């Protein structure tokens, strides 16, 4: 019998290369434009992943678009945290196999704070020693953790999917531990981590918003990512979006 966790493993996309162009002025602007080009391709990969995610296609198309537009930065930063954990134990930002950034190069203008914020996400994977299956279940829950205050068009379907993957997270925890003493404690810690992602990514999103709107910074964005931000940004800045939290705020 096939399991949901085994399917999450098989649909996880391969890591993308940047195609980086080390033969140029390592300016802050060019690095940010390079990262956004990689980010746009990673979002395309994440859309294809969501289409294959068991249950996601049952949502109204408009809800599928809302969830991807609202959560894309959480997905990208969480996966960056995982790669940086597995490839460098949280010491370097492992954007792609050909684009590994150590924190000396984060001294570039506008780069220090955002790199510290990305490293903090990776440091949580190190602290908790997150397993691959726990990571895969948590990543689905991030896709399902930011919603309009006024609700979704297929609310009942959404409620069912979200509860399904909360249960799957519990199953991944039970598998990680040939015993029982820590199952609830572990679920508590990982749902605390999920809740904390909203704030841990908030500064990254605000910085992205500013580089998108402030054209004099000359940061370039690829086409589909620009479309996504242009829809997400007004909703976030207007306060019309809410996080789904497991614990009292």
């Amino acid at each position: 019998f096939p399991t949901l966790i085994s399917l999450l493993e098989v649909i996880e996309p391969e890591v993308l290369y940047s195609g980086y162009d080390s033969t140029l002025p390592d300016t802050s602007t060019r690095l940010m434009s390079t990262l956004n080009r990689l980010g746009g391709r990673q979002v395309v990969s994440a859309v294809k992943w969501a289409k294959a995610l068991p249950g996601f296609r049952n949502l109204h198309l408009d809800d599928q678009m809302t969830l991807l537009q609202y959560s894309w930065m959480s997905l990208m930063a969480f996966s960056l945290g995982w790669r940086s954990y597995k490839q460098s134990n949280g010491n370097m930002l492992c954007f792609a196999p050909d684009l590994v950034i150590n924190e000396e190069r984060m001294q570039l203008p506008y780069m220090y704070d955002q790199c510290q914020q990305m490293l903090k996400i990776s440091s949580e994977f190190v602290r908790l020693q997150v397993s691959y299956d726990e990571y895969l279940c948590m990543k689905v829950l991030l896709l399902l953790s930011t919603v309009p205050k006024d609700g979704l068009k297929s609310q009942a379907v959404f409620d069912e999917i979200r509860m399904t993957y909360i249960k799957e997270l519990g199953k991944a925890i039970v598998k990680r531990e040939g015993n029982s003493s820590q199952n609830w404690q572990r679920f508590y810690q990982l749902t605390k981590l999920l809740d904390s992602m909203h704030e841990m990514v908030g500064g990254l999103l605000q910085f992205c918003f500013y580089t998108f709107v402030n054209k004099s910074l000359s940061v370039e964005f690829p086409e589909m990512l620009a479309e996504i931000i242009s829809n997400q940004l007004p909703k976030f800045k207007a306060g019309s979006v809410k996080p789904l939290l497991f614990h009292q705020k």
Binding site: V44, Q64, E227
Partner: peptide, 12 residues
């Protein structure tokens, strides 16, 4: 006809 909508409706 946004790019995201097109991708969600596309086959692959």
């Amino acid at each position: 006809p946004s790019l995201l909508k097109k991708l969600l409706l596309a086959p692959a």
